[PDB]
RNA sequence: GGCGGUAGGGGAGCGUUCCCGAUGCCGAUGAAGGCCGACCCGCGAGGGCGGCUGGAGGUAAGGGAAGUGCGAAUGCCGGCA
RNA sequence: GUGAGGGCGCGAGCGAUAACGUCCGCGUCCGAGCGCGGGAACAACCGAGACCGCCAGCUAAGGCCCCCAAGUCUGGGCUAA
RNA sequence: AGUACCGUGAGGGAAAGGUGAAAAGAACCCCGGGAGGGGAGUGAAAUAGAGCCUGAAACCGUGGGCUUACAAGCAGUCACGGCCCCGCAAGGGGUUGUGGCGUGCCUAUUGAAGCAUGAGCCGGCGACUCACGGUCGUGGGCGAGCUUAAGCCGUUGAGGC
């Protein structure tokens, strides 16, 4: 019978952004987000890497975008279709347009949200100095 | 039997649930200067008496 | 459906009333009501060839004759309708009452005999029937009577 | 000669109903619920049925590619070379190696590097 | 050791005095006794008098004293349903369903 | 000792003598029979060829028997047609003894 | 080697009520039926066994005759939501 | 049993070289394969005809960055919307 | 019971059986206005206590095990895990946290999960027959023949003429 793991510590991980293509980053980010890299993989359980983003302005992004993306925020409320573009977003919350595009690729599912928590981002460097560092690119 | 109609039957797991806050709340009582009968808050008593 | 008490008349309008749609109680869907395709008096009896029916008793008397139990009999000392006279000819005759038996005779006196006694069947000679013969071990019948079976079939 | 429906039925009933025992609500109480219940149920059993075979085969694949992926090249390439080397002995299943005995893992991989060439 | 009471057909709706029951689900005979006194419900009359008889039982023909026993537990059925005529607009008649209730009540010894 | 063997169709890992279960064989109740199909061991038996050269993992036929009735059926709907077919597979209770690659 | 399948045709079987088998046989050391089951046999419909209820009937092998199996008919009667 | 057929490709009438339009013909699938893979989902488009089992193995269509199985493959060009 | 009831009237027309071998059908005491219970006594049995044998289903209820308030669903199914429960073990049973997949049944249709039909839920009733004749197949008898009809004799679930 196919192996049947256990509970496994969390292995935290510090990811660079500067000069980084705001997509290939993510997809590693997320495909990493679950321990889809580690050969013990088990979607039931959900173990994946806790996932510490740092420089989060400093992402790169090609063509347009920055005057072309949009991102859509749609209140219940007739009208409320609020739009921003992609600069607005580097302007206040920039740790967002790492966190929506790595959000959009983490399984839909209910312990994807859960995978969601595992990743934290922020724009310095400098994270909540805690313990586990393992810098990567 | 006219426009007001229910659609389907209340599955009887909704019904209970609807219920939930229906249960009652016992009485408030305490000990009296008289016996040691309990009588309600701010109140006198038969078998009891009362004072002024 | 047809011989119902019940009346001709109509239950509800069928138009605009809600209700399903009917005419009277008679009607089988209606607990009480005439029976469907109820089973009606009637013969189940039919006409079998003259032949098969002596074919059959021939083979008949034939098959527990040669199996080895057609006792042809005469001599009948049960002077009259005396249960202990019979049950004292069949043991000095080999029927201990370990064997069915058919006895066929003419004497209506023989009858009286194993008339009640239950482990043997009393029968006339022409009532030879191919029911009662392969419906018992043992076949015995007066010589007499086998007389008249050969009339039918010799 | 009628024939009362007697008890036919009713077994017929509690037959079926127990098979269905632990669904939801009129779902497993009603005779009849239960089977249009029972009626999907042994479908989906049969289209899982393949559905599990389906489901270890990439499982496996999962594991296997991040293990060779952990020694560094693909799991197209990493099957590749022992399609190629002639070995039908690690069938995806019992790739699980790179959980028990990693080494012996790492040998197959080794010798799938040395197989393309 | 137990004492029961129950009081089978009790024109009264089971739905009604179940809210009765379930105040005095497992509580000291005194503390319930209270309870019914000046509770504020019609189920009140009935749940106590089916209650203190439980008791008498408890006493008399199970040697248990009242000072020591509570409700070890209660509960309330539902019973045969005495249906009714109800006249109609248009000419409708309706089924009123009075139903009724066996009150199931039973005590036992404390603890040691 | 981790020797694989394929038999049946399906193959998998071997323990130093342990019970097992796997398709059913034409061997005798309590026999015992050789499967030459054998893949790695315990200290690297690299398969050069599919299976492994001269090498034989063997054990006992610990007896035969069908096991769980699983059930089978289907249903098409807006058609009269079911089907209710029950079935069981049968196996031998291999219980694995030399290991002797 | 064939084996998806509605209308269809064809083939085999299961269970229900009664009949011969019955002046027999099973049965208060418990009949029919009801409740439970992860055991047994059958592809299956079913059959069997074990515990519990139940309180007087039941009926092989092999045959025979049918008021013979319901999920729906705004179907019928009743009971309950 | 059937005598409403339908979609599709192709060849024609009608239509307006309109219609999930319509009327014949040749074939095809759906019908009855709403069983499976692909196509986001989707009777008829692409793959392929389900006797049952299996925690085996190659492949079809499509696909191989993340949701998602499997290349951020290799080499050479084009395209800044 | 042609009763109850419905209809001016002609007429329509129900539902409704069962304690136990025996009534031995529950004395007395306890709570209670009573109904009802509780103990005692009867019986083989009182979940046989009185519309009481058996006593199923829907349906209402009490106690326990498992489970649930960041969750999106034809309600299941496949896998994994944890909890609880039977077995010496392997194993099995009850429950569901997470992951995978997934458009109810019947009818009617070219085509339905369909926002087309029917169904509140359960239990009981309910629909391809019978007679005569025809036709094809079939088993058996007899064969250039085969067969009787009404009826009569017999019997009292005998056949024969
Ligand atoms: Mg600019
Ligand atoms: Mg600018
Ligand atoms: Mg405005
Ligand atoms: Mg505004
Ligand atoms: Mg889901
Ligand atoms: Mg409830
Ligand atoms: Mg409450
Ligand atoms: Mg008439
Ligand atoms: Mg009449
Ligand atoms: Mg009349
Ligand atoms: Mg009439
Ligand atoms: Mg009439
Ligand atoms: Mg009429
Ligand atoms: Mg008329
Ligand atoms: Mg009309
Ligand atoms: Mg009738
Ligand atoms: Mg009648
Ligand atoms: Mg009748
Ligand atoms: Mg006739
Ligand atoms: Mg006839
Ligand atoms: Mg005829
Ligand atoms: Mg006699
Ligand atoms: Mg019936
Ligand atoms: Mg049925
Ligand atoms: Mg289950
Ligand atoms: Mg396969
Ligand atoms: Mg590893
Ligand atoms: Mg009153
Ligand atoms: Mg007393
Ligand atoms: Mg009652
Ligand atoms: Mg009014
Ligand atoms: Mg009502
Ligand atoms: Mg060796
Ligand atoms: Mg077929
Ligand atoms: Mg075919
Ligand atoms: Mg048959
Ligand atoms: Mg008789
Ligand atoms: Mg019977
Ligand atoms: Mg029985
Ligand atoms: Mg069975
Ligand atoms: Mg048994
Ligand atoms: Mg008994
Ligand atoms: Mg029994
Ligand atoms: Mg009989
Ligand atoms: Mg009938
Ligand atoms: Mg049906
Ligand atoms: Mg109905
Ligand atoms: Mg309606
Ligand atoms: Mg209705
Ligand atoms: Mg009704
Ligand atoms: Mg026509
Ligand atoms: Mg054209
Ligand atoms: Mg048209
Ligand atoms: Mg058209
Ligand atoms: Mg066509
Ligand atoms: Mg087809
Ligand atoms: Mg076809
Ligand atoms: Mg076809
Ligand atoms: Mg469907
Ligand atoms: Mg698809
Ligand atoms: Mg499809
Ligand atoms: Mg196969
Ligand atoms: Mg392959
Ligand atoms: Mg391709
Ligand atoms: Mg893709
Ligand atoms: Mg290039
Ligand atoms: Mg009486
Ligand atoms: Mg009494
Ligand atoms: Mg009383
Ligand atoms: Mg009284
Ligand atoms: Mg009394
Ligand atoms: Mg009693
Ligand atoms: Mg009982
Ligand atoms: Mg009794
Ligand atoms: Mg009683
Ligand atoms: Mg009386
Ligand atoms: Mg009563
Ligand atoms: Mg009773
Ligand atoms: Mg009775
Ligand atoms: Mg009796
Ligand atoms: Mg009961
Ligand atoms: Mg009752
Ligand atoms: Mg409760
Ligand atoms: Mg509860
Ligand atoms: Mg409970
Ligand atoms: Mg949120
Ligand atoms: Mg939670
Ligand atoms: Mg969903
Ligand atoms: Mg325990
Ligand atoms: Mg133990
Ligand atoms: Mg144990
Ligand atoms: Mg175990
Ligand atoms: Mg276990
Ligand atoms: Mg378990
Ligand atoms: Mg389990
Ligand atoms: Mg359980
Ligand atoms: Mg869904
Ligand atoms: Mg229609
Ligand atoms: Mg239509
Ligand atoms: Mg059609
Ligand atoms: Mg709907
Ligand atoms: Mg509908
Ligand atoms: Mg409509
Ligand atoms: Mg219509
Ligand atoms: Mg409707
Ligand atoms: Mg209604
Ligand atoms: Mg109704
Ligand atoms: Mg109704
Ligand atoms: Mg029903
Ligand atoms: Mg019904
Ligand atoms: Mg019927
Ligand atoms: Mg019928
Ligand atoms: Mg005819
Ligand atoms: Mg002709
Ligand atoms: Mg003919
Ligand atoms: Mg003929
Ligand atoms: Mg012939
Ligand atoms: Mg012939
Ligand atoms: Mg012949
Ligand atoms: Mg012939
Ligand atoms: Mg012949
Ligand atoms: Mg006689
Ligand atoms: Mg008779």
């Not at chain 1, 039931?44 to 806790?50: I, K, L, S, T, W």
């Not at chain 1, 302007?91 to 959000?103: N, S």
Request: hydrophobic letters at 40%.
């Amino acid at each position: 019978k196919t192996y049947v793991p256990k509970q496994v510590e969390p292995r935290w991980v510090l990811i660079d952004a500067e000069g980084k293509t705001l997509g290939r980053l993510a997809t590693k980010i997320a495909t990493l987000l679950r321990g889809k890299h580690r050969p013990d993989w088990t979607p039931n359980v959900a173990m994946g890497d806790f996932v510490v983003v740092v420089n989060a302005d400093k992402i790169r992004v090609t063509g347009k975008k920055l005057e072309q993306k949009i991102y859509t925020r749609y209140s219940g409320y007739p009208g409320g279709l609020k739009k921003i573009p992609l600069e607005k977003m580097l302007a206040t919350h920039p740790e967002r347009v790492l966190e929506h595009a790595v959000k959009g690729m983490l399984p839909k599912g209910p312990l994807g949200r859960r995978l969601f928590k595992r990743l934290k981002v922020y724009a310095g460097p400098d994270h909540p100095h805690q313990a586990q560092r393992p810098e990567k690119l | 039997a006219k426009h007001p109609v229910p659609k389907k039957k209340t599955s009887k797991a909704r019904r209970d649930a609807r219920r939930s806050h229906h249960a009652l709340t016992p009485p408030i009582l305490v000990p009296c200067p008289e016996c040691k009968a309990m009588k309600p808050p701010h109140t006198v008593c038969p078998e009891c008496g009362y004072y002024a | 459906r047809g011989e119902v008490a019940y009346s001709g008349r109509k239950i509800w309008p069928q138009k605009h009333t809600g209700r399903a749609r009917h005419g009277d109680i008679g009607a089988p869907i209606f607990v009480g009501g005439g029976v469907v395709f109820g089973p009606k008096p009637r013969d189940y009896s039919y006409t079998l060839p003259k032949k098969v029916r002596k074919k059959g008793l021939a083979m008949a008397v034939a098959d527990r004759a040669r199996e080895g139990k057609l006792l042809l009999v005469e001599a009948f000392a049960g002077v009259n309708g005396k249960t202990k006279e019979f049950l004292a000819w069949a043991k000095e005759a080999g029927l201990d009452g370990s064997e069915s038996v058919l006895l066929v005779t003419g004497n209506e006196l023989v009858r009286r005999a194993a008339r009640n006694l239950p482990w043997v069947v009393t029968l006339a000679p022409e009532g030879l029937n191919v029911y009662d013969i392969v419906r018992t071990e043992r076949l015995v019948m007066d010589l007499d009577a086998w007389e008249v079976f050969q009339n039918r079939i010799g | 000669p009628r024939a009362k429906t007697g008890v036919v039925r009713r077994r017929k009933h509690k037959k079926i109903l127990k098979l269905a025992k632990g669904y939801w609500g009129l779902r497993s109480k009603s005779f009849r619920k239960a089977r249009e219940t029972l009626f999907a149920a042994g479908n989906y059993a049969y289209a899982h049925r393949k559905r599990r075979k389906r489901d270890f085969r990439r499982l496996w694949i999962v594991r296997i590619n991040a293990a060779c992926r952990q020694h560094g090249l693909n799991y197209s390439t990493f099957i590749h070379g022992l399609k190629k080397a002639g070995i039908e002995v690690d069938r995806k299943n019992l790739a699980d190696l790179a959980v028990r005995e990693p080494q012996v893992f790492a040998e197959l991989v080794e010798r799938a590097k040395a197989a393309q060439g | 050791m137990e004492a029961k009471a129950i009081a089978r057909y009790v024109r009264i709706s089971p739905r009604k005095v179940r809210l009765v029951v379930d105040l005095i689900r497992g509580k000291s005979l005194e503390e319930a006794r209270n309870i019914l006194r000046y509770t504020n419900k019609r189920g009140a009359y009935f749940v106590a008098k089916v209650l203190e008889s439980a008791a008498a039982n408890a006493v008399n023909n199970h040697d248990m004293l009242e000072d020591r026993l509570y409700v070890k537990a209660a509960y309330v059925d539902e019973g045969p349903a005495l249906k009714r005529v109800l006249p109609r607009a248009r000419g409708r008649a309706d089924i009123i369903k009075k139903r009724t209730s066996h009150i199931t009540v039973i005590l036992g010894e404390k603890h040691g | 000792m981790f020797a694989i063997v394929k038999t049946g169709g399906k193959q998998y890992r071997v323990e130093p003598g342990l019970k097992l279960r796997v398709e059913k064989l034409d061997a005798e109740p309590g026999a015992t029979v050789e499967l030459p199909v054998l893949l790695l061991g315990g200290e690297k038996t690299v398969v050069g060829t599919p299976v492994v050269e001269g090498a034989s993992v063997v054990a006992e036929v610990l007896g035969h028997g069908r096991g769980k009735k699983i059930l089978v059926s289907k249903f098409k709907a807006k058609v009269q047609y079911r089907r209710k077919k029950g079935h069981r597979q049968p196996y031998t209770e291999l219980l694995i003894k030399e290991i002797r690659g």
